[PDB]
Amino acid sequence: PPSPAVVGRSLVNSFKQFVSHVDATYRLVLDCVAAVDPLMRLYTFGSTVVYGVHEKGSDVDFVVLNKTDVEDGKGGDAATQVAKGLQADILAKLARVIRQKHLSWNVEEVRRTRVPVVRVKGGGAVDFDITAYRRNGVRNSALLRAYFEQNPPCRWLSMSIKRWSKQTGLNASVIGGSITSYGFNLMVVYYLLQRNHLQFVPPSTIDVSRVEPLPPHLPLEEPADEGLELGTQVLDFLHFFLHEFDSDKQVISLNRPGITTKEELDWTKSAEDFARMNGEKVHYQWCIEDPYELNLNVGRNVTPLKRDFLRRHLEKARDTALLTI
Ligand SMILES: O=c1ccn([C@@H]2O[C@H](COP(=O)(O)OP(=O)(O)OP(=O)(O)O)[C@@H](O)[C@H]2O)c(=O)[nH]1
Numbered sequence: 001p002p003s004p005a006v007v008g009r010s011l012v013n014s015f016k017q018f019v020s021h022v023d024a025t026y027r028l029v030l031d032c033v034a035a036v037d038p039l040m041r042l043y044t045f046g047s048t049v050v051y052g053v054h055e056k057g058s059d060v061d062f063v064v065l066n067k068t069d070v071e072d073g074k075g076g077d078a079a080t081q082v083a084k085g086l087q088a089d090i091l092a093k094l095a096r097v098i099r100q101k102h103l104s105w106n107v108e109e110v111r112r113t114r115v116p117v118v119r120v121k122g123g124g125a126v127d128f129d130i131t132a133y134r135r136n137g138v139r140n141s142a143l144l145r146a147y148f149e150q151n152p153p154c155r156w157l158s159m160s161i162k163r164w165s166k167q168t169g170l171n172a173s174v175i176g177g178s179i180t181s182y183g184f185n186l187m188v189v190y191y192l193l194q195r196n197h198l199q200f201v202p203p204s205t206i207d208v209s210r211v212e213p214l215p216p217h218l219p220l221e222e223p224a225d226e227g228l229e230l231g232t233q234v235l236d237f238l239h240f241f242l243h244e245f246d247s248d249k250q251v252i253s254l255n256r257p258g259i260t261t262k263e264e265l266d267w268t269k270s271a272e273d274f275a276r277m278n279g280e281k282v283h284y285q286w287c288i289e290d291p292y293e294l295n296l297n298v299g300r301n302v303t304p305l306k307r308d309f310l311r312r313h314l315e316k317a318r319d320t321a322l323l324t325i
C-alpha cells in the first residue's frame with residue numbers, strides 16, 4: 001500500500017526525460033490552405049492548446065474556417081448530410097494540393113464517420129488531422145485551457161492519466177479502447193470541480209471570435225515538494241471514481257455545477273433501444289455529456305464489458321502508481 005509520497009516520487013522520476021516549434025508546421029499547412037483559397041483561415045486546437053505545451057508523440061489538430069464562420073462566434077455545428085458534403089468536398093481539394101506539394105507524406109481521407117477529416121502522417125515529427133467548417137473543437141479546447149490556467153500545476157495530473165490510459169488499453173487510440181483523451185480531460189476537470197479546487201465557468205462564455213489561431217506557450221514548472229501533492233491528487237482521483245461517483249445514476253458533465261442525473265436527460269435503457277448512431281447503437285453505462293453537441297454521450301462506446309475493465313484498471317492503478325513502480 002504505497003503512500004502518496006512514494007507515488008509522487010515515482011511520477012516525478014518518470015518525467016525527468018520529458019523535462020528537457022509549431023510555427024513551422026502551422027506555416028507549412030497554411031501554404032496549402034492558401035493554395036486552395038487565400039481567404040480561408042487556419043485554426044489550431046487539441047492538447048497543444050489545452051496544455052499550452054507540445055508533447056513528444058502527439059499530433060496536431062487543425063481546422064479551416066471562413067470569415068462568416070469566425071464572425072458567428074457562438075453558433076452551433078450542423079449535423080445534416082449537406083454539411084458533411086461541403087466539408088468532404090473542400091477537404092478533398094485540400095488533400096489533393098497536399099499530396100501535390102509533399103510526395104513522401106501519407107494523406108488519408110476518412111469517411112463513414114460523424115466528422116469528416118483528413119489525416120496526415122510523415123516520417124519523424126509530422127502528424128496532424130484537419131477538419132473544416134466547425135467551431136466546437138476550438139471552443140471546448142479553449143474552455144479546458146482556461147480551466148487549467150486557473151491552476152497550472154494540475155496539468156501534471158491530467159498528463160499522467162492520459163499516458164496511463166494509453167498504456168492500459170483504455171484509450172480509443174488502441175485496439176479495444178473506448179474513451180478518447182478528450183473524455184479523460186473531461187473526467188479530470190469534473191473531479192477537480194467537485195473538490196472545489198476550481199471555479200465553475202459557463203460554457204456559453206467562450207467566444208470563438210476572440211481566441212488566437214495559435215495561442216501562446218505556457219511554461220511548466222517542476223514540482224518543488226518532490227511530488228507529494230501529485231501523489232495525493234492521483235490517489236484521491238482514483239478513490240473518487242471508484243467509490244464516490246455512481247455510474248448507475250449520475251452523469252459526468254461540465255454544463256452545470258453539482259450533480260446531473262441520467263433521468264433528467266432520458267439516458268435510460270428504454271432510450272438505448274431507439275438510439276442508433278452511424279448505424280450502430282449507443283450505450284448509457286458510462287455517461288459523459290458533451291458541452292456543445294446536442295444529445296451526445298462521449299462514453300457512448302462503453303459496453304458493460306469495457307465498464308468492468310475500466311473498474312479493474314482503476315483498482316490496480318493505486319498499487320502500481322499508474323504503472324510506474
Ligand atoms: O469527440 C471528440 C473528440 C475530440 N474533439 C476535439 O479534438 C480535440 C483533440 O482530440 P484528441 O482525442 O486527440 O485529444 P488530445 O489532442 O487532447 O490528446 P492526444 O491523444 O492527441 O495526445 C479535442 O480537444 C476536442 O476539441 C471533440 O470535439 N470531440
Ligand SMILES: [Mg+2]
Pocket residue numbers: 046047058059060061
Ligand atoms: Mg491530438
Ligand SMILES: [Mg+2]
Pocket residue numbers: none
Ligand atoms: Mg485525435
